[PDB]
Design a binder for this molecule. Structure first.
Ligand SMILES: NC(=O)C1=CN([C@@H]2O[C@H](COP(=O)(O)OP(=O)(O)OC[C@H]3O[C@@H](n4cnc5c(N)ncnc54)[C@H](O)[C@@H]3O)[C@@H](O)[C@H]2O)C=CC1
Ligand SMILES: NC(=O)C1=CN([C@@H]2O[C@H](COP(=O)(O)OP(=O)(O)OC[C@H]3O[C@@H](n4cnc5c(N)ncnc54)[C@H](O)[C@@H]3O)[C@@H](O)[C@H]2O)C=CC1
Lengths: 326, 327
């Protein structure tokens, strides 16, 4: 039976990479058909028709059907996975608050729609920026969907961190395990080498260089989005779509034993992350359910960085509360 | 498995951007066969290419064993077993499709020589850049030490587009559609052949039962699909062209299903009255990196007319690149 998958922002950059991955089998593998439900805003519908034409022209055996629309209550109808990509990208004259203000209402409305018409088993992945806060907004506006069903994307941060570590250590990405991104999808994010493993050995022990971690690794990961913008002239697209795919796939199909991934999810207070925030944690997944990895010891350096990020998250929560978005 | 060395030219372009990430995540060889990407561009695009590689790196693809970038085809093609020649000017910005022949041909003269000098003995070469058939003809001719059967031009997009149209018309799913054939040139003279195609074990032309629909709607719709995409999106069909490039290479290397066949523009041995030595689209089955033209098909009158128009065009293009000294 085809999985009903809603994708918002389907005519934009990320969408133009993502839809073809989805329809070709990148999400659930070669034996699981997919129904795509694509949401856009009015002046993009024509372009969306174009995208659908290309989808048709790929002759994808797993693509059971495509519906397009501009009403979230039509498109989210009975969907089991909602990928909320639609939102404006970061502009050059924008402060973070500018983008937060620009995009939040989207998630108020979409959270309400999901609450009204989504399938009982729905999982909701939020890619549109600011990811964490937009997920908080959607979650809060869908009180009849379990709060655990909402996750903001920090998987791009996670994969970027894996890439940087792999490059530094001369290891293959398949040798890198238990990478963690803590907190916000922003320049305050904390990539944690202290619980990661490179080819079976503690990553911090392998790289043996605190000054590298602080001066090169962390800010290269944290500011990689900006670096991509500078090198390419626009924010990440194909890699954001790939990260969206990885996160949703792992969420639905489960994480490898002896590994974990980064997902921004609602905090119950674990690791001193304020309750109610959407914050990136190390998690394992099984049967569509995530579990925050337990028993980790948080060193003083890591604690300082994590707190910096959660402080930023709390500020964002206050800001959207003031705007009346939640 | 040891990483397959795959060259992709035009890597910083639109098709490239839609192609590389699917290649690196396993679309070509499946979940357990790593690949080494070797990416070729011209100098003004190298900076953009760096950005692309940044994104590739940021996907942390387990199958992507490594990436090399450069502008020297002798270096980038070194040891490759698959060369996907996507690099070439597209239509637009002062150029119509007919202008591409002279604009792009020399690329393939040069890359042909490069491949001849440095590619792995087992190399297969797929030409996407337009005009695809004639560019493949040029590449093949300038690589005399590589078997002629190793070169193929992409008609798989036409093929997939025709499958799409047929499935929509008949209310069938794409999995119902078998034995689609595109004959001839990847151009407006292409001939999508419903007479040998199947819709779930039924003759496709009979299922549609409407010769007027075939001639007046189906064929021109398939032919002009690129322009339709542009008119709708405001940008060209990069994702579906990338998808077709992947399909063709994948089926070439891994083989076609036993109940099916695909379209590939390959060198003609005179089969079906297609002048020898043209790179022309044929129905083919594939096994282990080799193609075989499907034999014994009865060519009806109408089909014959259309096929001959397309091969006539291909002959004129061959003559043109011969006059230009590209072969
Ligand atoms: N979390 C992450 O790792 C990353 C997040 N992003 C964010 O993802 C978002 C999308 O980025 P791009 O695709 O590059 O931008 P884009 O502008 O190319 O595409 C956004 C699309 O969303 C559509 N849209 C706007 N409002 C909508 C609504 N209410 N419902 C449905 N669709 C709507 C627009 O019409 C547009 O086509 C941006 O906010 C960007 O900052 C981007 C990269 C990485
Ligand atoms: N056979 C088919 O079904 C299709 C063929 N095409 C053709 O594919 C070609 C590429 O299309 P797009 O990606 O849309 O164009 P594009 O302009 O976005 O990209 C072309 C890229 O090729 C690069 N390039 C030029 N000369 C090169 C050389 N000697 N070596 C390496 N790279 C080189 C350019 O710098 C550019 O980055 C065009 O010729 C287009 O007409 C396009 C769609 C379908």
């Amino acid at each position: 039976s085809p999985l009903k998958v809603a994708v918002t922002g389907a005519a934009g950059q990320i969408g133009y990479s993502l839809l073809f991955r989805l329809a070709s089998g990148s999400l659930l593998g070669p034996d699981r058909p997919i129904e795509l439900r694509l949401l856009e805003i009015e002046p993009a519908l024509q372009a969306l028709e174009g995208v659908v034409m290309e989808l048709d022209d790929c002759a994808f055996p797993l693509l059971s059907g495509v519906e397009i629309g501009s009403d979230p209550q039509k498109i989210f109808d009975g969907v089991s996975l909602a990928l909320l990509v639609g939102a404006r990208p970061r502009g050059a004259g924008m402060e973070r608050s500018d983008l937060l203000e620009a995009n939040g209402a989207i998630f108020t409305a979409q959270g309400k729609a999901l609450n009204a018409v989504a399938a009982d088993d729905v999982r909701v992945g939020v890619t549109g920026n600011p990811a964490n806060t937009n997920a908080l907004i959607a979650m809060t506006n869908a009180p009849d969907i379990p709060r655990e069903r909402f996750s903001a994307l920090t998987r791009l941060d996670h994969n970027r961190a894996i890439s940087q570590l792999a490059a530094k250590t001369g290891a293959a990405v398949t040798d890198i395990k238990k990478m963690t991104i803590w907190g916000n999808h922003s320049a305050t994010q904390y990539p944690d080498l202290f619980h990661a493993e490179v080819a079976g050995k503690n990553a911090a022990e392998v790289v043996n260089d605190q000054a590298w971690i602080e001066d090169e690794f962390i800010p290269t990961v944290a500011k990689r989005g900006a670096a991509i913008i500078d090198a390419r002239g626009a924010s990440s697209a194909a890699s954001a779509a790939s990260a969206t795919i990885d996160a949703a796939r792992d969420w639905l199909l489960g994480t490898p034993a002896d590994d974990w991934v980064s997902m921004a999810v609602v905090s119950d207070g674990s690791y001193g992350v304020p309750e109610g925030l959407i914050s990136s944690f190390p998690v394992t997944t099984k049967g569509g359910n995530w579990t925050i990895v337990s028993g980790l010891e948080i060193d003083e350096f890591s604690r300082g960085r994590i707190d910096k990020s959660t402080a930023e998250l709390a500020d964002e929560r206050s800001a959207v509360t003031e705007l009346g978005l939640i």
